Structure formats: C-alpha cells, structure tokens
Enzyme design. Structure first.
Site, mmCIF file in Angstrom:
data_model
loop_
_atom_site.group_PDB
_atom_site.id
_atom_site.type_symbol
_atom_site.label_atom_id
_atom_site.label_comp_id
_atom_site.label_asym_id
_atom_site.label_seq_id
_atom_site.Cartn_x
_atom_site.Cartn_y
_atom_site.Cartn_z
ATOM 1 N N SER A 31 0.858 -1.195 0.000
ATOM 2 C CA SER A 31 0.000 0.000 0.000
ATOM 3 C C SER A 31 0.895 1.247 0.000
ATOM 4 O O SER A 31 1.701 1.431 -0.916
ATOM 5 C CB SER A 31 -0.996 -0.014 1.183
ATOM 6 O OG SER A 31 -2.001 0.993 1.060
ATOM 7 N N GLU A 34 -8.056 -6.236 -6.039
ATOM 8 C CA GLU A 34 -7.575 -5.128 -5.216
ATOM 9 C C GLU A 34 -8.731 -4.359 -4.595
ATOM 10 O O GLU A 34 -8.787 -4.189 -3.373
ATOM 11 C CB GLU A 34 -6.671 -4.184 -6.023
ATOM 12 C CG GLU A 34 -5.370 -4.807 -6.520
ATOM 13 C CD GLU A 34 -4.302 -4.965 -5.443
ATOM 14 O OE1 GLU A 34 -3.149 -5.282 -5.801
ATOM 15 O OE2 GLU A 34 -4.596 -4.779 -4.245
ATOM 16 N N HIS A 56 -6.483 -6.963 -1.456
ATOM 17 C CA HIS A 56 -5.351 -6.085 -1.207
ATOM 18 C C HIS A 56 -4.653 -6.438 0.111
ATOM 19 O O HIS A 56 -5.243 -6.333 1.192
ATOM 20 C CB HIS A 56 -5.842 -4.634 -1.195
ATOM 21 C CG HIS A 56 -4.755 -3.615 -1.046
ATOM 22 N ND1 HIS A 56 -3.790 -3.411 -2.008
ATOM 23 C CD2 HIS A 56 -4.499 -2.721 -0.061
ATOM 24 C CE1 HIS A 56 -2.977 -2.445 -1.615
ATOM 25 N NE2 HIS A 56 -3.388 -2.009 -0.437
HETATM 26 NA NA NA Z 1 -3.994 1.417 1.462
#
Ligand code: NA
Ligand SMILES: *[C@@H]1O[C@H](CO)[C@@H](O)[C@H](O)[C@H]1NC(C)=O
Ligand SMILES: *[C@@H]1O[C@H](CO)[C@@H](O)[C@H](O)[C@H]1NC(C)=O
Ligand SMILES: *[C@@H]1O[C@H](CO)[C@@H](O)[C@H](O)[C@H]1NC(C)=O
Ligand SMILES: *[C@@H]1O[C@H](CO)[C@@H](O)[C@H](O)[C@H]1NC(C)=O
Ligand code: NA
EC number: 3.1.1.7
Lengths: 537, 537
Positions: free
Chosen positions: A199, A325, A439
């Site tokens: 991230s 994602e 994610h």
């Molecule tokens: Na993030």
C-alpha cells in the site's frame, strides 16, 4: 563487552534478546531502538531530529509504541479487521526501529527493510502479520522495520516551516541513515539494503527511489500493490493547505489562510487523538485525507514528471498486484450494498448505480464507456459478473494499472524489473469467498506466517510461503528472484521487459507466465478514457 | 408417356437428362425450365409474368442463361475471382429454374432450394461451386436453384408502376410458387421446401420469412452470412429514386424528378450492359447500388420494424457466420494497402488510416472508440493484429453481428435456432494465407465439392464436407441438424437459445461449442457505439 546481545550504536549502546521463531528456529532481536527525538510539543508536524546520545546500556527488548492513528471497529472483533489494528499502545512518541538478525549472526549479509502502510493514516511495524522472525531465520537475512509518523501528525502541509509536510517521509529518511550508519554492527551490509512495502509501503519505497535525499541510502526496491503514480499517493499543495485549514476548523482552531502561524500553534495544543479523528471530510473511494505532497526538499517535483524525465535511481525492481484489489475498499466504502456475508451478488441496476458512486468525477459520457468496458457481454446481467466488475474498475484505476506504469518506465530506462500477479487465496481466509485474493493478502506469505505451527495453513501453503520468501530474499541479495536451478537459463520468472511486459503468476500449482497483467484495462484508464473526457468536454 | 425423364408441368411438358455426379453417382436433372415470360422490352424493371403455356415436349437439358450483370476482371484469370464469374451467356432472358432429383427418384421427399447471391448486383444458379449433383446424390434430397433478376434490372425503384422495385424478389416469389405447384411431379414435397442462401441469398431467404406474399410458399430456412437487418440489405425509398435518377443521368436519359415516366421509358431503350455498368457512384465498403427496398407489396415495412414487432414466419432457422468476413471486401475496396500477395501486414499508422476510410460516417469521437475496441492491447503496434483488426470491424458491423441479431429475435420468439461459426480454411485455398476463412468459403463444402475426385481435397476435408452436408440436409428434413446418434439427448449442435446464444464451431477436429459468436463486438456496434454517437452529437 564481549556480549553478542549488546550492540554499541552511534548514540549509545543497546541490549537485545534471543527469541524463538514460531518455526522453532532462534533469532536475535532489538526492539524499539529510538532513531529520533520524540516529535512532541514544538516538534509536532515538523521534520525529525536525531536521537539525543544516551549513557549506559538501554533495553531494546520489547515492541515499541505505534503512532497515533484511528482504529477499525466497523467490524468489531473480526479477525480479518483486527489484524491491521495496532497491537501496542498509541503514542506521539513512536519513532523507533526494530532489527532482527538470524542465528548464527553473519559477519556481513543482506538487509531487508520493511516499510508498512496504512493509506498514510494508520499502521505499525509491530503488527503480528509483519513478523521478522520467520523471514530472517529461514532466508538468512537481517530484517528491519521502522515506525513513521502517520495521518495529519505525519503529513500535514501548510507551506509554513512549522508545518512543511512529508514529516512521515523524513522520518523514514532518517531511519534509512540510521541503518546506513548502524547496521554493520548487527551483521548487515549498509550498501545491500533492500526496501520493501505494501500500500503506502510501496508508495513510500517508491518515493525513496525518486527522492534526492534518500537516493544513496539503499540498494534495491520491492513494491507490493502501490506506486508513486497512483491517484491517492499525493495531494496538490493548494489542497493540502485546505485539508489542513479544514482540520483546523473542525477541531476549533483559527482556520484563516491569512494567518497560518496561528493555525499550527493551536493545532500543536490539541490532543493527538482528537486531531486524527477530524481528518475525514467528503472523500471518495480510495482517497485519503493526509498523504505525501511535493514539499521542495524530499521531492521538488511531482512523481509523474520524475518518471517522464527519467529521474529515478537506476535499480532492479520487484513489483506486483493482487487479483482483487478493489474489494477491500468497496467493502468499507459503499457499505450498503456488498456487505460482509457469504454469497453476496450485484444486480445490473445496482452495478449501474455503483459506477457513478465509485467514479463521481466523470462526465457520464465516460460512465458508459466504463460500463461497456467493465461489463461481461457474454452474460451482461450476471449477478456474479456485476460484483466482480466493481472490484476490477476500482482495482485497476487505483492500484493495478499504476503499478504497471511505474514498472514499465523502470523497464524502458534499461532497468531489470520483475512483475508478479499474486493469485493465491488462503484456505483459512476469514473474509467471504467472493472477495477472493484481496489487497494485502500476500503479506502473510512473504513473512512466513504459514510456517507457524499454531496456525492451520495447509502443507502446500507452507511450501508456497517458503517459495515467495525465497523469491523476495535472493532478489534482495542478487537482484534476481530466480533460484540457482534455472537461474542460469530460461528463468521461472522472466524479466518484465519494456515491450514484452511479462509477469509471473504466484499461485499454488501455477508457474504460468503472462503479459501485463490487464493491459487492456490499463490502456483504458491511461490512454482511451482521458482523451474521451477531453473530446466530450 | 411412361418415360421417367419427361415431366408434365402446369405450362407444358419438359424432357430431362441423366448425368453422373463427380462422385460417380447418378442423378436426374432438368436445366433451364422457364418459370416466367422473358422480362424484355415493356416488361423490364417490372414484376414477372408466369410463362406462356407451350405445346409439345421442351428440352430442359442444359444450364440456362445468367442474368445481365458486371464481371470481375480486377484479378484477371485468377481461379479465386473467376469462380464467381458467370459461366453461361449473359441475357435479359434469364428467368429459369433448375431441378435435380437423385436416383432412384423418391415418391415424396425433402426440397432444398438454393438462392444465390452476388450483393444483389451479380450471380447465377449455374456456377460450378453450386452443383446440385453432389448434394442431391449423397443426402437424397431434391435440390432446386433459381435465377432472379439482378442489379438495376432487378432492383430499380422509382415508386412508379413502371418501376415499382423488388423485381428480383418477385422473381424469386414466382419461382417459389412454381415449386409449390410443380415439385411433386419431380418427387418432392411442396410443403417440405427449405430455402437456403449466402450473402444476398441469406438476405433474400430472410425476406421470404418476412414477406406476406411468399409466407406459405416454403417450410424452413437456412441462412449463410446474411440477414435482413444488415446495413447493405435495403435502401430508403428516397435514395432508391435518387440512385435511379443518377443512373438515368449517367446513361444520358431524362433525370428530372418531375417527369418519372420519361426516365423509365428512356431506360427501357438503353442496352442492358451499359445500364449495369453505370450503377457505381460514390459508395463506401460493403454497400451496393441496387438492392431490395420496402415496396409496399412484397414488404410494407422495414425489416427492423418486422423483427421488433415479431412479424415473421414461426420456423426453425439454421444460420451462421465465417471467421473472416471483411477481408474479401477490404481487398476489392481499399486496394492500395492489403493487396493480393502472401504475407501482407498493416502498420499502426495504416490501421488508423483505414478505420476512417472504412467508417466514413462516424464523428471521430466514435473512430477512437472503434480503434480502442479493435486494437490488440497486449501488443498494439503488431502488424498482424492491425491487419486482422480491419477484417473484424468490417466483418462484425456488415455481417457477423447482423446474423446474430436475426438469430436472437427468432430464438426469443420461441423458435428453434441453430447458429454456426465456420472456421475451416481449405488446404487448397487459392487466396493468400492471411485471408483465412473468407466470406463464402463454406459453399464448396455444403455442395459436396470435396467429393469430386478431379479436385485435390484432403481425405479429412471430404469427411468434413459430408458432415456439414448432413447437418444442412436433415435440418431441411427434420428441423434439426443433429444426427440420429446423439439426436436423442445432449446434441452435438445445441439450440441457439435466447439467453444461452450457443453456436457450434464447424471445423476439422473441433466439436467445440461457444456462446455468440463475438458478443462483445456486437454489443459494441448495436448498443454502445450508437448511444455514444448520440451523446457526442
Ligand atoms: Na492502502
Ligand atoms: C530489561 O531491563 C530491565 C531493567 O531495566 C530488566 O528488569 C529486564 O529483565 C530486562 N529485560 C530483558 C533485557 O530481557
Ligand atoms: C495443476 O492443477 C491441479 C492442482 O490441484 C493438479 O491437477 C496439478 O498439480 C496441476 N495439473 C493440471 C492443471 O492438470
Ligand atoms: C434435346 O433436343 C434436341 C432437339 O431439339 C436434340 O438434338 C438433343 O439431342 C436433345 N438433348 C438431350 C435431350 O439430351
Ligand atoms: C484435435 O487437434 C489435432 C488435429 O490435428 C489432433 O491432435 C486431434 O485430432 C485433436 N487433439 C487435440 C487438440 O489434442
Ligand atoms: Na455479398
């Protein structure tokens, strides 16, 4: 001192502790080493200062404080939500480094530095999911993690010197110099430091590849589901000031753009927790209130211009995306539809509703350009298709495609790039089935969590974890993920070349190699759609 | 008369001849049976009259005249171009029917009636490629073909009764009544007549399914690469008059819209060959000067409205498309690039050039909507991709998608539909390799040309021909192509259902079943692109 567990750093000496890795293997750990003065009082919002030299022996034996941030309750004590919750006390004094050496401790070895990421609003190096013990012991690497200031405490920008912005990034930068200066005493190589994150971790790691200041503080980079060219990565300096003055207003401080020194001083007074809770105004999906900005020191230009002009460290890059994602973000946002339950679906009407809410800035001559691209025309009204179609359009625009762009620009500047598409969903995944591989799912596997006997990962999943731990590790070592067998020729994992654009599928029984991933949709968001919006406006 | 080779039709008696099929099997043929008075002099442009009853025995032993039309020279005596060239003398007196019965002659059997097609400007029933001998002998069916007036001689429209339009269609209509009235004497069933054609053949066959007048003159329909909803199928009555008055101008006749009776009478005078040579003005790709029009008698509304309202014969339909439709037409049109040679390719620049020339009526906010859809984004500048991409956009808009539409509307009105995608390219195909399977390649196989020993078709191709001849034949018989083995359950060839939209791949070793074909591109031309052009205009 002949003691192996005491180490003399530049600012004084520290004492570590031997711990068992979940696997049973023994490692040496140093936990909560201060790399900077606590950024409290007059020092809040400001760039960090190096730590004041200390006398005597300091205990670095326990996991340090996590930085002040919000926590996730929206799912109560769900194991899937609580794994990202900070597991140490929240403090403004959070600036520490954790070092984990394997036993026996090597004389000179590879360094893997983990930068966590919580969308620049949360996260800590102390999370259970980031455990250095399994990675360091199995791959024989010095594993290091750092705490960087987060949210408005880390990324408030007003242009003033009392709030110059990128404090969190300057935190990381200072922590990189600490590694450069102090890692050889733990048995590492200051020149063989490989940064890796997820991230914001990837967005941070990338910004070090760009930045003038942290240029020569590391060797290579591994980037997981993030790039500096992503929409949510940076904010305009004009907006960052408005976000700051809005936060000033919301907390009950002077919000006038006329007198900026009044605003910052009032902010320094307010409690840190009330400060981080008032950041969230009207924000769409996958956009965050306080993030990096082009300050002038760390970055003097936008990452888009840097990439275009080719101003970035000439290095090997290992980067990639996961299959689904968007899902994670479309769960928290857009919470009405697509809730946390098994067998959820989306009607054709609900789908058409969503693309408006998930893309609120497009003129509607673009909306159906999206719906046509992101609908399955073999069976358009399919409830499964319409659901998965939401994950893709969010996943591609906000994550997958941006990773592809950064990876291409590195490839066509003559750098070696290794692109992956992580396709593996755990058998013990706590989230609903339809979510698939979300994610941040690869993290458990890169850190060797399946090697934990107290957790019920299948015997194949334990092999898979060791495999991607190997890929990751010997890339940090050699600049190449391929094992010595087949490293000589026709690799398992081919180079992501400018024209070829190959990737490796990381899954249980697939060694499959494709080209992309998802080149069509990326061409959609990058080439076609922008010029369509131009032609219709 | 006990003679089996003499038959007494309503208008008199005829004498046939026994011939060997290329296979060696014996059939009875009647060639050049007049079904109408020769449409010469005052009768030109007008609807046909039934033949004047004749006395004595007439010889129908040799292939009749082909209708006045242009011939293809643009490739000289190329075998690929010359196979569509008329092989009999060109005459205005061309209105004849050919009947071929197998030996032994059945008492009552199935009737397969072939309507040829030359884009409504050319063609004849006498072509070598349409040979009844192989089909009739192997499948035991009465094979019939007809000659219908073509070009401006067949399809001139002025609204006046001296040129009412659809003369070629009324020719076919009259020939269908002849079959109804006379086929039982040849051993056929007047109620088991199945119409089948290609290009305009399919467009004609479809227009009989629609037309009020030819409604009850047949049973089933087989349609090859054509539907009534295709762009080139019909013209507006307003344009058809202008096309006629332009032809009047070009030939040196009165072209004034004020006095129409002057124009038609001057036209009746001019030589038929000079008349057919002056039809070609400014016309884009896949559009033809003289075609069917909604006259008021044969059709009283556009096929689009008929399909929408559901006004068509409730019947089984066997229809399909070939893999590369466009190529044939992009060779003759756009002749500069993409010439007749091996290994031709298309540069990215040339591709971008072509989509403008091949779609001259779209606003350019649609052009790149096309280029994005019709480019391969895994390798966009690929010279092979860019060439094949031209065939698809022409093939889909002008042919493939229109077939899908007609097939769907029949399916969702509760009719049994059988959709095919013909993927087989002959080993002995005279055209360049890159052309692949072009428009009208299946014809050789449905007529049993590979069963000819004097031609070098592989032993597998001879099996394939017999296979699709079977599919075609027992559909005309039973309403279903599936053989008795597997006809009872889980067919080789599934029904093309309204929601399922399944098709069978007709190829050498593939029994593969898909859904479509090409649903995405069809949704493009039918749904997305039209509303985009609306939003940008
Ligand atoms: Na993030
Ligand atoms: C750390 O030092 C403290 C004394 O300050 C001691 O009580 C504790 O046992 C030590 N823990 C370690 C180093 O394991
Ligand atoms: C990959 O797929 C499965 C995994 O369960 C297994 O049959 C084998 O390992 C591989 N074989 C295939 C796809 O045939
Ligand atoms: C057709 O009839 C003609 C006489 O008009 C005759 O010369 C010819 O042999 C016949 N051909 C046939 C029926 O095969
Ligand atoms: C279909 O493909 C080929 C045709 O030459 C042959 O191997 C066999 O008939 C089939 N088998 C496959 C695809 O494995
Ligand atoms: Na045609």
């Amino acid at each position: 001192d002949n003691d192996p567990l005491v180490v003399n750093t530049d600012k004084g000496r520290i004492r570590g502790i031997t711990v068992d890795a979940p696997s049973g293997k023994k490692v040496d750990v140093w936990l909560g080493i201060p790399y900077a003065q606590p950024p409290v009082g007059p020092l809040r919002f400001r760039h960090p200062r190096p730590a004041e030299k200390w006398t005597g022996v300091l205990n670095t034996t326990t996991p340090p404080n996590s930085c002040v941030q919000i926590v996730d309750t929206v799912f109560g004590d769900f194991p899937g939500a609580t794994m990202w919750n900070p597991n140490t006390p929240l403090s403004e004094d959070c600036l520490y480094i954790n070092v984990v050496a394997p036993r026996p401790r090597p004389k000179n070895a590879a360094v893997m530095l983990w930068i966590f990421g919580g969308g620049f609003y949360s996260g800590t190096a102390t999370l259970d999911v980031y455990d250095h013990r399994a990675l360091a012991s199995e791959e024989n690497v010095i594993v290091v993690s750092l705490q960087y200031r987060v949210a408005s405490l880390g990324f408030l920008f007003l242009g003033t010197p009392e709030a110059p912005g990128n404090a969190g990034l300057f935190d990381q930068n200072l922590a990189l110099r600490w590694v450069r200066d102090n890692i050889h005493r733990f048995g590492g190589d200051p020149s063989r430091v490989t940064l890796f994150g997820e991230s914001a971790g990837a967005v941070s790691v990338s910004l070090h590849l760009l930045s003038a200041l942290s240029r020569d503080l590391f060797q290579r980079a591994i980037l997981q589901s993030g790039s500096p060219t992503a929409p949510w990565a940076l904010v305009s300096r004009e907006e960052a000031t408005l976000r700051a003055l809005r936060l000033a207003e919301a907390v009950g401080c002077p919000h006038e753009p006329s007198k900026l020194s009044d605003a910052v001083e009032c902010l320094r007074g307010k409690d840190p927790h009330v400060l981080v809770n008032n950041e969230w105004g009207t924000l769409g999906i996958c956009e965050f209130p306080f993030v990096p900005v082009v300050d002038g020191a760390f970055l003097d230009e936008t990452p888009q211009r840097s990439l275009a002009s080719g101003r970035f460290k000439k290095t090997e890059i290992l980067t990639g995306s996961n299959t689904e994602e968007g899902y994670y973000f479309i769960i928290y946002y857009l919470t009405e539809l697509l809730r946390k339950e098994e067998g959820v679906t989306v009607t054709r009407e609900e789908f058409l509703q969503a693309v408006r809410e998930l893309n609120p800035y497009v003129n509607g001559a673009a909306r159906q350009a999206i719906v046509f691209e992101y609908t399955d025309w073999t069976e358009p009204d399919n409830p499964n298709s319409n659901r998965d179609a939401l994950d893709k359009m969010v996943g591609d625009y906000h994550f997958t495609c941006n990773v592809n762009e950064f990876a291409q620009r590195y490839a066509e500047e003559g750098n070696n790039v290794y692109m992956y598409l992580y396709t593996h969903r755990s058998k013990g995944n706590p989230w609903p089935r339809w979510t698939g591989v979300m994610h941040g799912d690869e993290i458990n596997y890169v850190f060797g969590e399946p090697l934990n006997p107290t957790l019920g990962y299948t015997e194949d999943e334990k092999d898979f974890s060791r495999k991607i731990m190997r890929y990751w590790s010997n890339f940090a070592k050699t600049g190449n993920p391929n094992p010595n067998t087949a490293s000589s020729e026709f690799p398992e994992w081919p180079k992501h070349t400018a024209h070829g654009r190959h990737y490796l599928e990381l899954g249980l029984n697939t060694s499959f190699v494709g080209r992309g991933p998802r080149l069509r949709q990326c061409a959609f968001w990058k080439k076609y759609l922008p010029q369509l919006v131009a032609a219709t406006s």
